[PDB]
Amino acid sequence: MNNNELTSLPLAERKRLLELAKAAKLSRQHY
């Protein structure tokens, strides 16, 4: 049996980049 195949992919991070953008109320390109 296999598991968390989606975590082995980069799409999970592409999703998070947007998530962090909504969270980051200042959306400053800089950190």
Six-digit token string for 6: 């989606």
Q: Alpha-carbon distance 7 to 2, whole Å?
A: 12
In DSSP notation, 3-31 reads: --GGGGSSHHHHHHHHHHHHH-TT--S--
**Cβ 30 vs Cβ 24: under 8 Å:** no
